[PDB]
Every structure is written in C-alpha cells, then in structure tokens.
Design a protein around this nucleic acid. Structure first.
Lengths: 171, 65, 35, 234, 69, 190
RNA sequence: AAGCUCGUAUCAGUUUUAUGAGGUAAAGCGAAAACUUUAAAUAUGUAAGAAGUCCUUGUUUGAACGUGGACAUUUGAAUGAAGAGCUUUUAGUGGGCCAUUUUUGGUAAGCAGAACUGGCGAUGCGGGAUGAACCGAACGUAGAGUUAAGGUGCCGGAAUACACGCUCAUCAGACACCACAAAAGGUGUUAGUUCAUCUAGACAGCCGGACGGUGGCCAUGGAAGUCGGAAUCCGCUAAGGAGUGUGUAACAACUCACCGGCCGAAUGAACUA
RNA sequence: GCAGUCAAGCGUUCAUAGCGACAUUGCUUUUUGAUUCUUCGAUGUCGGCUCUUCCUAUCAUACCGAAGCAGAAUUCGGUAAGCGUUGGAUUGUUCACCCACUAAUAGGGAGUGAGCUGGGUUUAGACCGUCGUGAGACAGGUUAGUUUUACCCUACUGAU
C-alpha cells in the first residue's frame, strides 16, 4: 500500500509471584495499526510461548524518517517461507526512506518469488553509511562521478484519437 | 511343484488347485542338496507364490525356511 | 573414481580365486471375488 | 551469463595445483638462506633447456641456485628502502627483469665471473632474435633434417607431418608416393632478419642448432661489505 | 495366512538306505509288453538317474579367452 | 542486467576517412571506398578526435549488448580492407582427370568455368562478384588467387568455388578431387 | 387444521462458569527421558434454586424418611423471545445423487463401507461464452439511489488508467486447478545461497620449460610414456605422470597435466527460485 | 515378473527410521549355426467386394547425414503425405500361409442392414449322436435356411 513503520511494545499479563514482566519491543512495517498489532502477536507466538490471550499491548507508535529528503543506500535482509524449505536473502536498495525501500522490496519479492505479505519476514534494514561497502552491482553502477544518461528511447504519450502530424519521439 | 497345500480366500480353490498370489505350494528341492540332522535328505518343502501369474507366465515363489 | 585413485570371508585355497516367529512374507493379499 | 557460457574442460591427470604454500616456502627459503652465504648474484636465463640448467647446477654442489616468481623474489628482498631483510638490497632488486634468477655462493667473485664468462651452448633460435644463417630447402623430396647433411645417408621424411607444413608452416607441399615432395625453391630466413614466430618453428623443425646461448649477469651483492656492484657480462 | 510351525517344517525326507535300494532297482527293469502302468509312486527322480558315461563333455573355452583376446 | 551504458572504440589510421550519417557508414581509404548499412542494429555513434570513434548502447540487455562488438568488428574489417586489402588463395587437386579452370565472359558477366571434373561433361560456372579480381598464380601449378577490398565478397566467392565441386555418392576417403582454400591473408604483405 | 383443555418468565441446534473426557507436551521444571505435579483448546457429556434454605427430630446420630414455622422477587450467569405438551384422525411420503469434515479398510490406478454438515428434488434472479450440482442472492406491482460475484481494446455498459518487475514461444498465454504424463533434459533469461582463486598478479589468450636413472620390469617378429599385464618407486627442481591425446612397423614430432614470461581486476564451481 | 547388490539425492534436521533414479547379478533346459516333425479349450464375431477423403507412426520416388562406403549392391538415420502402393492358388476353416510380376507391393481412421453377399443369425420341418424312467433337453453332426421407400424437406449433380 503506502506503508508506515510502527513501534509496538508488548508484555505478558501481571500475576502473583511474577509482577512487572520484561516489556518486549519490535519495529513493524505495515499499512495501519491493526495489521501491526496482528504481526506483533504472530511473531511473539512464533518466537516463544507467549499468547495474545495471556499478554497485552503496552504501546504502539509511528516512527517517521529523520532526513526524508536525502538519498541513501540500505541493505535489507529477508527470510521467507515459500514454497519449499526457507532461505535467507540480502538485497541492496538505493532510495530516500526506510518505508519506501521496504515497499519496493515487497513489490520486487512479489514480482519474482511468487511471495505475498504473510510469507515474508523483514529481519533488518540497515543504512550503508560508508561507500565502497555496497556489494550489488546494480546499485554500485549509480555511484560514479558526473553521471549522465538519456531518457528511454521511443516513448511518447497522447490523448487525441486522431492526429495530423505523424509524431516525433524527440529525440 | 508337488501340491497346492493351501490357497487363501477359500478352501474350494485349494481343492481346485488355483495358483493366485499368496498361495502356499509344495516344491521338490533335490537340486538344493539339503540334509537334515540325523542324515536324511530333504526333497520337498513349502514356498509362497509372490506374484500374480495371470499378468505374466512365470510363477515366482520364495522358499519358507 | 579417479579422484579416489590418488590417496587410497575365510575361504579355502580352492574356494578363493572363484566367484558366484512363524509368519509368512505375504499375509493379507487382496481378495478376489467369485465373479 | 546464466546460460550460454563456455563449459571448461575437465581432464583426468595425476598432478595438482601447487597453491600458496609453494610461494610461501620459496619466499621463506630464500630469506633464511640469505644469511648463510655472502655473495648473491642475479642471472638472466630466459630459454634454458633443463639439462643445461642441471649441468649449471651440478657444476658445483656447494652453492645453491634458486628460481621462482619474480615478484616473490622481490617480496623477499624489499621494494622500497623502508623494508628489507638486509641492508641496501633494493638496488639490485630493482633490476631483475626477465626470468630471474638468484645465485648464492661461497666463492671469490672472479672465479664465478669467469665461469659465467667462458660458458655457452648450441641451441635453437628462440624467436624474435636475428636469423644467423641462410638455408634453402632443396627442390625435391623434403628430407627429415632439412637437406643440410649428405642426403644419400638421410631417410625420407615421414608422411604424418604433412598437414603441419601445409597449413601452419605455410609451405606448398604435395604427396606423391609416401615421400613428401616440394618442387619450387623455398626460403625460410634471410641471414640478418628479425624472426617472426613462424620462422623459429620452421627452423627448430629441422634440428639445426645454430644459436649461442650464454648465461648473463646484471647485478651482484656482497654481504660483509653490504653494497651492490652492478657488473654487466653477456 | 495364519502363522504356524508347519510351513518351515520339512515334509518329504528320504534316507540313504532307501536311496541305494531304489537306485539299484532301476537297472533291473525287464519291461513286459503286456503290463500297463496304473500309478507311478512319486519319488525323487533326479537323485536315482545318472548311469555312468564315458564322455566328459567339452570344457568352456570362453572363460579364458573371451573374444577381445 | 541492463547496464546503464556499454561502449566500444574504433581506431582510425592516418589515411582513411569514415563518415557516418544516420547509420550508413562510408569509409574512404588509399585503395577505394566501402559502404555499409547498419540501420538494423540500434547503436549510437560518436566521434572523439579524427582518430577515435566510440560506439555506445544506453540501457541494453544481454542480446542487445552482444550485437555491439560485432558492429565494431565490421567497421574494423572495412578499414583494414581499404588499407591492406584481402587475398585468398585456393588450390585444386586431382588424381586422373585434370580440372580445367578458365575465366570466360558471358555477355559482360565474368564467369569461372570448371571443366572435366572427375570426367564429368557438365560445365560448372561460378559468377565472379563485382569488386573482386581473380587471377591464376604462376610459379605454382593449380593455384587461383582472389583479391579485393571486401571480405564478405572474397570469402563468399571462395565458398562458391569450393562448394561447386562436391563429390556425390562416393567414398570421400578414396576420392580426393576438389578445390580447397589454401590461405587467407592480406595484399600487403608485408 | 379439525378442535379443547393450557402462553405457563418458562424456553433455546448459542456463549460463560464448575466438573468430567480426550492426553496427545506443544506449557515444562524434576527424585538417579523418568513421571504427574499442569496448561491451550478440538467437540465432547452433565449441572447452574420455589418439587429451594434453615430451625425443630418420630420411625426401617451419618443413609433415606415425617414433621410444626420462618423464606421475597437485581429470587441467584449472558443473549434472544411468546408458536412447547396430551387427545381425536387426516392428507401426501416411506427408500437417491454431488461435495466438504472425521473414521476404518484398501491396489497397477481407481476406490469401498460407516457418520456429521451444506446443494438438489418443490426454485426463479445476477456472473462463469454455453451448464442440476461453481461463485453471489430474503421472488407482490412500480420510481430513485448504492452495491455483491464477475468485470472494463472491439464485439459489450464500464480506465488503449497509474506504479514496480518478469516473458519471445515454427500450435506462448490468458483453465472447472493447485491431479496427469511431472522426475529429469536445455551453451534461453533473471534474481538468490553456500564454498573457493586473487596486485607475493586471478580468469582468456600468445611465448618459453616439460628433466635424469630410463628404451623401469613380463611379455614377442616389432611394443622406446600411449596393442597388453603387475608395480607404480627413486633423484633433481619453480614445475615436470614409470604418462591425457594425436602419430610411427618400431622411433622421432606435436599436445595437456604441472611451472614460468607478456598484459592488467575481478573470476570459477555447486545449488535453489 | 520375483528375490537381491550398489548408491546421486530425498525425507524436519537423519544414511543406518526410512524411501530411493541410473547402473548390475540370479533362471525359463542342452556353449560348436545341429532341426525342435506344440499345431493343446478365443463362448463371441470377421471377411470382401464398389467408391471417396483424411492422418504419418514412410514401403517406393526427390533431396541429405553416418558406416571398411574402392566400384556395384546394401545397412542405420533426417526433411517430406506431391504421387503410387498389383495378379492368383487354397474351407476334410483362410482370427493364415504360399509363388510370381514390380520402383514398391507401408500402416491406419471415417466407417458402412437401403449400394452387394458369405460361415453366424432362428424360425415351419426332418433325422443321427449324448443325456433323461418318460414327456423332453442338448457336448454334437447334417440339411433347410425371403425384406421392398424419396412420389416430402435438405445435400450433391446438371438445366432455366
């Protein structure tokens, strides 16, 4: 969709001989808050034996970008279960914010590996602070001095159904 | 072969002599040269047929030892 | 075989140098009708 | 290149790649022998028949001869002043160019510089030198050795190597009865010519050793004084 | 098929005295052209055959020089 | 993987002038002029300084970048053609029936006549191409030399001469008659 | 319905609580996995007030059994609400397919027998080109608006919309579908995982070395690394097999396995989608 | 087919719990091309004229690739359905096999009771054999052993 990133802090319910549990926290990518809560409970129950029935959501907030207008490179690490045995995977995405990088990663996984939103688990999104640490060549080829290139050839948009001019793809 | 000792799924077929799969038959084993304690010479034992010999010609059997 | 070629029952003298419960193996076979 | 790529050729032979340990052992041996002798020469022996090299070796069983990767010898000695086992070495390490070449010894300088002065063997052209002779293949049956022996003692050339001279050595030949024959005069090399790649092959095919090969020296180092002395012998 | 100790039991043993008797009583036939057979008294017949020969059939030459030799 | 740009370079010697309009290349040299039409290849040409011409592909795939070094090689071949020229050398062999080769003009057409092949009576003609000169080399019996500015004419004519004399329905281990290509070099030499 | 005694705050294809039953660990932890200390459900039975509580105690004090008064409706969980029970008898019916969810048994492969729950027959309407079992859907007569399922190049009402990738098929593909040939074969293309080589210079190319005992032993007309058989060692090296192919009647000659020289930055193998 | 051996992978991780491709051995009669004188129960229908058209899984004709392919004649393959693919003898049976001509005598589908008939339809008869106490029935065998339309609408062929 148009994703957002939430911070969800949950906790097991209080009880005698165990007051004040240990307040676990997660960063989740989702389109609204209900999906974020659902993912939090899913991942807790998967990690260990806590249950929505026995826990509670202490807080849930939104995390904005600190510099939403500065181009950055991220490395993304993903694990997903489809179709046979799982496998981890590291990709590089050059974009402007963590949310948009994740959105394009999801679209790309859908395009290639027949993967949907409930098969994919984002493990880490980390900015590559130092150049020459980027690995992938399809990103590396955008970091050269004095870069110039022309727009794709032979495209043009029209609205009339009849034209009198035999257009030119100027060029 | 020397007899059809026992055919499953009926005694009437045991009488008639039918050789379906699972049948227990009695074979002459003088070619294997078996000798029993006390020094006698076995020449007849039991085997089980292990195929459907209506989908081929051979009757295949495993000795019972 | 080639790769392995780099690093690397009591028969008599006349028998070497030569060569070659009470259940039944098949219980409960399928059933055949009289038809 | 996910598909449509060159399938490399696997082959079933006994020997294996030598690996990094060989470079390391060589670089260790040269440096740990560097402080066992006193005079360290350098040689330029490029196209050396291994039997000749072995004769040079055995001409004294008291001194060690080392051969290896050029840059490995440099890494043993030292590239800049700011790294070297012993002192002032770089001034000969900056000179070794071809197939070098390192001679340890425990003998006076003059005996060695005269041994390497009075030595030469007879050999083949080793191309891109000058052609020090002018021979033409006679215009009949091309005999095995080329035509420079008494031809009535020679045996006619075997049939099996006609396509080499007809394709690669670019010599117009035909096949009459089993002898290989030529009918037009042929010139291989003109005496005093830069020899391209094919003429050395055509010459080595006829077994005429007509080249002087002498080992040469370019630099030198004496330990108990520790300063190089570059003397040129050829 | 139920399990049972028969089936894994010998059924038709025979002894050396009977073997020798029957083998000696196959070279004394004296067929009568007017006697007809009524029953045959099932016996192990591959042990009582094999009168003596004088031939000793040919040896297999294929075990030494196959064909590529 | 859709590289942003792929590039090659064509070096030009000091006698020839290449001139490239839309995609119709024309090279003029010390030996003649050659023209080629590359309008089916989708590349961008650029001149650097009178001795270097860069060819480029913007944002191209694997099959599209494959056809770039081939354009480079065609233009290079044209340049070496107009400076050095090409000379192919063919030879004919025979056992019993001599192959009799001749050049004959049939209404201003310059065919090559091949008679007596294996005793045949058919008169095989191969039409010489326009731009490639042909002559029988002396000092060597049974040798025909073709020369010219273009490779794709010399080599094709040699192919026609070679393939006009196949041996049908015989053991090509025993029957060795034919016309085969002996050498492919330059006119200069050396 | 005939009809009449009864809408009596009592009922219910429902949840909650108490408790049994599955006992599978998947809570979770042990006295040297060796538990039962104990979950969370999965549908599985029963129970949750007036025919009920207390006082007081006569018979075959605890067991049932008799007795003489106190006890009030937020009177003993939640949701919904008025259509359960006898008598008369009176009409039709009394034997069958599809699918899902459990269970048992099955062989070439199908499947067969039990049980629950939906569809059909008795039933139109919208969609799937066309359809009894597929997706939607509360059938009087009309007006207006909004939608379901399916769709939107033209047939044909509705974007030749927007954004990111993949694909070239000399019968592409657009499927009652996730079953059948179905596991592999391909120098088609794209992404990914794990191991390696590498400025003491990788991968591809050219050029040089490729040695000595030694034509190693047995074979036989001839077998010198290369028709065969048994070993497969030693020396010298940077490296060089008692030898990967071409070749000879036997040799010679070329070649790679392995080293080095020229050049200069990334390369290779296996594997998954 | 049955009983094994192997061993790349798969299987939650896993060899060894298990599966398990490709390879491999056991034998169904006799090591010297000797004649094998099996020819052993189809319970239901094949076999044959006249005439079109289609498939390719190709016999011949055209063109190619490979073989100890010297020449001649062959053998194994690729494209290809344009063209052709015969005359007779045999029912004490023809779910076949013979001998000739030929370039070759390939395999099939649509079939086909309204364009034709042979065993086989069964009947009306009769006799013989087997069975039954008998009337009768059949393990059989022999003989006898009738189906005709369009004058309607379409399709096809010609004609106004």
């Amino acid at each position: 969709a148009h994703f957002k990133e939430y911070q969800v802090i949950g906790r097991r319910l209080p009880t005698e001989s165990v007051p004040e549990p240990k307040l676990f926290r997660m960063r989740i990518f989702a389109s609204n808050e209900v999906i974020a809560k659902s993912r939090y409970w899913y991942f807790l129950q998967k990690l260990h034996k806590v249950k929505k029935a026995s826990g509670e959501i202490v807080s849930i907030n939104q995390i904005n970008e600190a510099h939403p207008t500065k181009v950055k490179n991220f490395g993304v690490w993903v694990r997903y279960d489809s179709r046979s045995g799982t496998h981890n995977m590291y990709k590089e995405i050059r974009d402007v914010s963590r949310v948009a990088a994740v959105e394009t990663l999801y679209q790309d996984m859908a395009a290639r590996h027949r993967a949907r939103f409930r098969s994919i688990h984002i493990l880490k999104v980390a900015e590559i602070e130092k150049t020459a640490d980027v690995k992938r060549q399809y990103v590396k080829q955008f970091l050269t001095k004095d870069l110039k290139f022309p727009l794709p050839h032979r495209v043009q948009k029209s609205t009339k159904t009849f034209s009198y001019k035999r257009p030119s793809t100027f060029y | 072969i020397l007899a059809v000792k026992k055919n499953p799924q009926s005694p009437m077929y045991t009488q008639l002599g039918v050789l379906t799969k699972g049948t227990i038959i009695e074979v002459n084993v003088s070619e294997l040269g078996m000798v029993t304690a006390g020094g006698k010479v076995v020449w007849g034992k039991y085997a089980q047929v292990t195929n459907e010999p209506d989908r081929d010609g051979c009757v295949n059997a495993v000795l019972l030892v | 075989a080639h790769e392995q070629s780099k690093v690397k029952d009591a028969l008599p003298t006349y028998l070497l140098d030569r060569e070659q419960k009470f259940s039944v193996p098949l219980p409960k076979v399928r059933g055949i009708s009289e038809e | 290149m996910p598909r449509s790529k060159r399938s490399k050729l696997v082959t079933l032979a006994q020997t294996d790649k030598k690996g990094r340990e060989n470079k390391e052992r060589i670089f260790d041996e040269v440096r740990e022998a560097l402080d066992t002798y006193r005079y360290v020469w350098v040689l330029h022996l490029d196209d050396v028949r291994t039997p000749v090299l072995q004769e040079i070796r055995t001409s004294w069983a008291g001194s060690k001869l080392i051969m290896g990767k050029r840059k490995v010898l440099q890494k043993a000695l030292g590239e800049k002043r700011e790294e070297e086992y012993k002192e002032n070495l770089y001034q000969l390490s900056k000179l070794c160019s071809g197939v070098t070449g390192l001679l340890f010894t425990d003998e006076d300088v003059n005996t060695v510089k005269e041994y390497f002065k009075s030595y030469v063997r007879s050999d083949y052209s080793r191309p891109n030198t000058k052609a020090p002779l002018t021979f033409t293949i006679p215009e009949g049956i091309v005999y095995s050795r080329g035509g420079q022996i008494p031809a009535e003692e020679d045996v006619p050339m075997i049939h099996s190597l006609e396509p080499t001279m007809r394709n690669k050595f670019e010599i117009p030949t035909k096949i009459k009865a089993g002898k290989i024959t030529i009918d037009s005069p042929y010139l291989v090399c003109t005496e005093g010519e830069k020899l391209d790649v094919r003429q050395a092959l055509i010459l080595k095919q006829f077994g005429i050793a007509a080249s002087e090969f002498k080992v040469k020296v370019s630099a030198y180092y004496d330990n108990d004084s520790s300063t190089v002395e570059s003397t040129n012998i050829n | 098929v139920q399990p049972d100790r028969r089936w894994f039991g010998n059924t038709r043993v025979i002894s050396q005295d009977a073997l020798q008797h029957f083998r000696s009583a196959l070279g004394e036939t004296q067929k009568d052209t007017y006697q007809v057979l009524l029953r045959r008294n099932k016996l192990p017949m591959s042990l009582l055959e094999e009168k003596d020969a004088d031939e000793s059939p040919k040896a297999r030459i294929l075990d030494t020089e196959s064909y590529a030799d | 993987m859709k590289y942003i740009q792929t590039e090659q370079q064509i070096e030009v010697p000091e006698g020839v002038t290449v001139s490239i309009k839309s995609r119709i290349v024309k090279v003029v040299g010390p030996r003649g002029t050659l023209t080629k039409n590359l309008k089916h290849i989708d590349v961008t040409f650029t001149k650097v300084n009178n001795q270097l011409i860069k060819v480029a592909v913007h944002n191209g795939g694997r099959k599209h970048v494959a056809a770039l070094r081939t354009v480079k090689s065609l233009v290079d071949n044209m340049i070496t053609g107009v400076t050095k020229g090409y000379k192919y050398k063919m030879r004919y062999v025979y056992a019993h029936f001599p192959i009799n080769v001749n050049i004959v003009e049939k209404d201003g057409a310059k065919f090559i006549e091949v008679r007596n092949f294996l005793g045949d009576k058919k008169i095989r003609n191969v039409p010489v191409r326009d731009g490639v000169t042909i002559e029988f080399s002396t000092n060597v019996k049974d040798e025909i030399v073709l020369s010219g500015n273009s490779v794709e004419d010399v080599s094709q004519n040699a192919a026609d001469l070679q393939q006009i004399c196949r041996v049908r329905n015989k053991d090509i281990r025993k029957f060795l008659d034919g016309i085969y290509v002996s050498h492919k070099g330059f006119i200069t030499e050396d």
